[PDB]
Design an enzyme around this catalytic site. Structure first.
Site: not given
Lengths: 597, 195
Positions: A487, A357
């Site tokens: 997806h 992150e």
């Protein structure tokens, strides 16, 4: 006056309001994701509608500036990005039908429940559901049932919706001057205008096939090694020259083989590296983890974080009075506002995800000076690669020993290295053939070479040919198993993972060669090095104004993707697998099936 | 002992915009530069041509003061020989400037939720400005080759708003800049320093 000055004035006037509107939309989205209420939903919807209306009204006005009269590359790229019509070329009825189909598929996927056959009142969800069953179970019938029920219940209500979706997407792509949806997806890897750095939408498939032809032997050896222990796991079920059942790969779809490490451990007597107990004993917290990540990122020559980052980010779980989503995401709102949302626990996985992150945040802060339309990565698989090259360096034994989490009395042997390499391989190499096969099948469906009455047939044929997985129960053309993935039902791509898998190792080798490292590649660490930091910052500052080929040449000195770094990384595991499989059979036959006896 | 009224310039409730700035005249008083640490001790001074040590024993005739509000990334443009959007279209200093530039952060004053649209700046103009020039025209800018009639394609408004918010970064925060010019003419100097 000429067209260039008018275009520059238009771009300035556009950006001036686009920044403010995007900031408002991002702030509304953050306020929604932090606290789940109805007023937040209303505000988010209003902001999204205003942003969409602004994007609509700003279009159809840049059509007065033809691209054949512009000689500046930046203005030309911005205008080409603004002149994209999109789904507005279709009629209103077809657009409404497409939106309805998309929302229906999303609601069907998000709302699913499997009920018990003997007790219709006992219905289980998916995530607090079949995931825990497929993760920890040693029963053939239970896994077979959890697979068949999930692929038969939610695998039959999405066939005609998906057919109509494909038809509408093909119509939209042909209306947008494309051949099909595959070309619309591959248009991201397209460079036209710069001599010596051009790229076409047809060379990507050739490069992917050329790389897979060399990746194949390592996967063959890994499969041959895994099948030998799977035979001992489930007796009288696995064939010594046959394929593998789909309900034994570790998860529902077999995307990752991480859960198979407990049964395929090379040396079970050697301990593992788990600093969780040390962190619990030393009484750390999220502040300590993030400060260590900041120290690591500063040790290479990167700027510090902002005060607003420490004042506005949510790094702990709020509790039970306030509900939120614990999915770790990086937020870039603009005007110098960067926040991170993550429910941090005292573990090692969170310690590794914090570096990912923070690398995302550093990448976002890198190109803050570029124009609004160019504030993005040079390619899809760049942010994840930058995060992974930092996670790999943070997951080294030398770094853990230097930061004080490992005792200085740790004896590094060869068996520990073999175990680490196998654990990394079961995660990295196991997802490449699956992604390749899925993307190739979707491309062939969008192109029109596979008729409607052969979808599942070609799917299972390509499965048994490339991946080497045979189904336990044959299915007719009434099922829609390929659409059971997130997806696939949410209209996302998959080649980004392959590109990232290659680029991460390329960048790792480049940075370890720049840092003057000696020895194996898996022991490299880029801590306390300014040369690698500068060489990476030179590429991170470009953003989207330069082609990705030049950005890759400024780092590794190459224009295309390569696979030699991965082979150099996994060479010792390759040698060990060869030594272990010298007395075993390599390969698999497609004639065997579990329903043949 | 008569002191110069610096509280009317440094302790104002509302400042002006960069395109329409105010200019005050100070004369016949004693310049006490020690009260400036009460408005804000952190005063970023920047003197070009004169030193603050030798500035106390000098006498001048007239002292001009200019005040405006800009962003944090535009403070560098307030200097002799700078190029940009503020130095070319809003406020320009000569190459032989003799004075000081003072700025400070006013985030907790000129910032509200839902945006503060009370500040404007000029971005579109035909030519550049001259040193110590002011323009407050509000005519529609013509960028094409057709006569401008109203507002639409190739016809834009020359003024744009800032919209400050307290959650912005350190570079997108409002700053208050004060410029001090010293002038010496063939007249008795009535502005000296304390003794």
């Amino acid at each position: 006056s000429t067209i260039e000055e008018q275009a520059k004035t238009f771009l300035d006037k556009f950006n001036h309001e686009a920044e403010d509107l995007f900031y408002q939309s991002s702030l509304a989205s953050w306020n929604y994701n932090t606290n789940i209420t109805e007023e937040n939903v209303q505000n988010m919807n209003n902001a999204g509608d205003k942003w969409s209306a602004f994007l609509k009204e700003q279009s159809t006005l840049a059509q007065m500036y033809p691209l054949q009269e512009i000689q500046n590359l930046t203005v030309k790229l911005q205008l080409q990005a603004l002149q994209q019509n999109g789904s507005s070329v279709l009629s209103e009825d077809k657009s409404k039908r497409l939106n309805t189909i998309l929302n229906t598929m999303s609601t069907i996927y998000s709302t699913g429940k499997v009920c018990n056959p003997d007790n219709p009142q006992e219905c289980l969800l998916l995530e607090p559901g079949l995931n825990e069953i497929m993760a920890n179970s040693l029963d053939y019938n239970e896994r077979l049932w959890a697979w068949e029920s999930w692929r038969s219940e939610v695998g039959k209500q999405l066939r005609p919706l998906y057919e109509e979706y494909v038809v509408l997407k093909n119509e939209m792509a042909r209306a947008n001057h494309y051949e099909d949806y595959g070309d619309y997806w591959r248009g991201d890897y397209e460079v036209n205008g710069v001599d010596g750095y051009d790229y076409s939408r047809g060379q990507l498939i050739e490069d992917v096939e050329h790389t897979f032809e060399e990746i194949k032997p390592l996967y063959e050896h890994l499969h041959a090694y895994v099948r030998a222990k799977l035979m001992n796991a489930y007796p009288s079920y696995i064939s010594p020259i046959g394929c593998l059942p789909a309900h034994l790969l570790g998860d529902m779809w077999g995307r990752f083989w991480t859960n198979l490490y407990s049964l395929t451990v090379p040396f079970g007597q050697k301990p593992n590296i788990d600093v969780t107990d040390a962190m619990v004993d030393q009484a750390w917290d999220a502040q300590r983890i993030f400060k260590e990540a900041e120290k690591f990122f500063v040790s290479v020559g990167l700027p510090n974080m902002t005060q607003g980052f420490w004042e506005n980010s949510m790094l702990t779980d709020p509790g039970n009075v306030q509900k939120a989503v614990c999915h770790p995401t990086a937020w870039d709102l603009g005007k110098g506002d960067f926040r991170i949302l993550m429910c941090t626990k005292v573990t090692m996985d969170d310690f590794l995800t914090a570096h990912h992150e923070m690398g995302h945040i550093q990448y976002d802060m890198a190109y803050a000076a570029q124009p609004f339309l160019l504030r993005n990565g040079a390619n899809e698989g760049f942010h994840e690669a930058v995060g992974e090259i930092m996670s790999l360096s943070a997951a080294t034994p030398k770094h853990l020993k230097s930061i004080g989490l490992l005792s200085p009395d740790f004896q590094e042997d060869n068996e520990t290295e073999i175990n680490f390499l196998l654990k990394q391989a079961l995660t990295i190499v196991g997802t490449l053939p699956f992604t390749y096969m899925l993307e190739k099948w979707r491309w062939m469906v969008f192109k029109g070479e596979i008729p409607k009455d052969q979808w599942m047939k070609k799917w299972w044929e390509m499965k048994r040919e490339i991946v080497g997985v045979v189904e336990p129960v044959p299915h007719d053309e009434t099922y829609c198993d390929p659409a059971s993935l997130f997806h696939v039902s949410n209209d996302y791509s998959f080649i980004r993972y392959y590109t990232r898998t290659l680029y991460q190792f390329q960048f790792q080798e480049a940075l370890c060669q720049a840092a003057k490292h000696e020895g194996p590649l898996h022991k490299c660490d880029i801590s306390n090095s300014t040369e690698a930091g500068q060489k990476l910052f030179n590429m991170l500052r470009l953003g989207k104004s330069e082609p990705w080929t030049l950005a890759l040449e400024n780092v590794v000195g190459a224009k295309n993707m390569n696979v030699r770094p991965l082979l150099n990384y996994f060479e010792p595991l390759f040698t060990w697998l060869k030594d272990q499989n010298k007395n075993s059979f390599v390969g698999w036959s497609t004639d065997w099936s579990p329903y043949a006896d | 002992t008569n002191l110069c009224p610096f509280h009317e310039v440094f302790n104002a409730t509302r400042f002006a915009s960069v395109y329409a700035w105010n200019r005050t005249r100070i004369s016949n008083c004693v310049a006490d530069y020690s009260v400036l640490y009460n408005f804000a001790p952190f005063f970023a001074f920047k003197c070009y041509g004169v030193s603050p040590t030798k500035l106390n024993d000098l006498c001048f005739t007239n002292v001009y003061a200019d005040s405006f509000v800009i962003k944090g990334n535009e403070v560098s443009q307030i200097a002799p020989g700078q190029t940009g959007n503020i130095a070319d279209y809003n406020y320009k200093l000569p190459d032989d400037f003799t004075g000081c530039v003072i700025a400070w952060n006013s985030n907790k004053l000129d910032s509200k939720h839902s945006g503060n649209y009370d500040y404007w700046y000029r971005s579109f103009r035909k030519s550049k400005l001259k040193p110590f020039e002011r323009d407050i025209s509000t005519e529609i800018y013509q960028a094409g080759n057709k006569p401008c009639k109203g507002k639409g394609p190739n016809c834009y408004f020359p003024l744009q708003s800032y919209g400050f918010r307290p959650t912005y970064g350190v570079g997108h925060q409002p700053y208050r800049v004060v410029v001090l010019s010293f002038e010496l003419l063939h007249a008795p100097a009535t502005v000296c320093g304390p003794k």
